[PDB]
Amino acid sequence: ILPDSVDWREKGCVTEVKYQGSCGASWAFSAVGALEAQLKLKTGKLVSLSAQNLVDCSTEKYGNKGCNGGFMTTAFQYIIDNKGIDSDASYPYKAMDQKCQYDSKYRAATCSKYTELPYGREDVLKEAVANKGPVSVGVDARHPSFFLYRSGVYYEPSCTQNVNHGVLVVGYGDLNGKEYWLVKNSWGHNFGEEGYIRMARNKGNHCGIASFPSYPEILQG
Numbered sequence: 001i002l003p004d005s006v007d008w009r010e011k012g013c014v015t016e017v018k019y020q021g022s023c024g025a026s027w028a029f030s031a032v033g034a035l036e037a038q039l040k041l042k043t044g045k046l047v048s049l050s051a052q053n054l055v056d057c058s059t060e061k062y063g064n065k066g067c068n069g070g071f072m073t074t075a076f077q078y079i080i081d082n083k084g085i086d087s088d089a090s091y092p093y094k095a096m097d098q099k100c101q102y103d104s105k106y107r108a109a110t111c112s113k114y115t116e117l118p119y120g121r122e123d124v125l126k127e128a129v130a131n132k133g134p135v136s137v138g139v140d141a142r143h144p145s146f147f148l149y150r151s152g153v154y155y156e157p158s159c160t161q162n163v164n165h166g167v168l169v170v171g172y173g174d175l176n177g178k179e180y181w182l183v184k185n186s187w188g189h190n191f192g193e194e195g196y197i198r199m200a201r202n203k204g205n206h207c208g209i210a211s212f213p214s215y216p217e218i219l220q221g
Ligand SMILES: CS(=O)(=O)N1CCc2c(c(-c3ccc(C(F)(F)F)cc3)nn2C[C@@H](O)CN2CCC(c3c[nH]c4cc[n+](O)cc34)CC2)C1
Pocket: 026, 027, 030, 060, 061, 062, 063, 064, 070, 071, 072, 074, 077, 137, 138, 139, 161, 162, 163, 164, 165, 166, 167, 212
């Protein structure tokens, strides 16, 4: 039996909204956001993890291009392969491609595996958000309505199921009858509701929110 509403901010699993700047690294912010929540569930400690570490180190082997884009799934694979990711404090974000400076001395999290959810399945996404944690997703963000969004439940008739911007689903609910996904963006506090957007849910995979969902886990064995 799934809750009607969830908000992982209430469970202490969501760090401050970040500002990616002119670097196209939303993939890296989406990935660290998902892992931040799993780290809190494991250790009780909420700590921002290094998006820069992913930008600089999860590169050609993972199909990622730093400030020119990339993928959450392969970001997670880098963290698995590397046996760690640094804290954001120890390896801060500069919004540029830099030489990899990963140092195991400042490791703040590990990742054992990741899971991809099936294309377009908002019911499966709901279950994962309720029972696993925040889920990294792609959205179609290429409409003025998206970047100008201030409040309410976002619905854009021209949205497609093709995704181009990485964000984090941290919850869901309903606002005066409109079902929504609660989405953490990485465009700082002047986007949306202090950095968050509520996006239409159960409206035929609106803006591709359920097209490419994935989440990491931190496990023994
Ligand atoms: C137009 S579309 O929207 O239909 N779409 C098409 C399909 C798609 C999209 C995203 C998608 C797009 C954007 C985002 C976001 F913006 F959020 F960041 C998220 C997901 N994923 N896939 C699934 C895989 O094709 C992604 N896969 C392909 C292999 C590739 C790769 C190259 N070298 C490697 C070395 C090692 N490994 O392991 C993998 C590779 C990267 C991983 C976009």
